[PDB]
Amino acid sequence: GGFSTKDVNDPKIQALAGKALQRINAASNDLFQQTIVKVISAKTQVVAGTNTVLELLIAPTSCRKNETSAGNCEAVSNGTKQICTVAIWEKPWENFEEITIKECKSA
């Protein structure tokens, strides 16, 4: 029917944000990896399989995508942060999980 607020520290919400980040980084024109600063919000609906919409606050790191960094990739002072709306759609009877990056914009 409609969306319901979900907790941004749910272990499943976190996993999903992580996956949405890999997707943002894989598809983004940026040469440098982005990292999640925080999950701003999370909300799920269940009309046809589960649809989860996340807002992620993300920052650039100094980890180049053209590389293989030695560890964690840490957010950097500037650091123009973005907010990306991401929709993740799950249909476990089709064994289906589709992550859609809906929009990113300057925050």
Author numbering: 6 to 112
Authors' description from the paper:
Cystatins are a group of cysteine protease inhibitors that bind reversibly to cysteine proteases and regulate their proteolytic activities. Structurally, a typical cystatin fold contains a five-stranded anti-parallel β-sheet wrapped around an α-helix.
Although CPIs from many nematode species have been studied extensively for their roles in the induction of immunosuppression, the structural features of this group of immunomodulatory proteins remain largely unknown. In this study, we found that the recombinant Al-CPI strongly inhibited the proteolytic activity of cathepsins. We identified the critical segments of Al-CPI molecule that could be involved in the interaction between Al-CPI and its target proteases. Mutagenesis study further confirmed that these segments were responsible for the inhibition of cysteine protease activities.
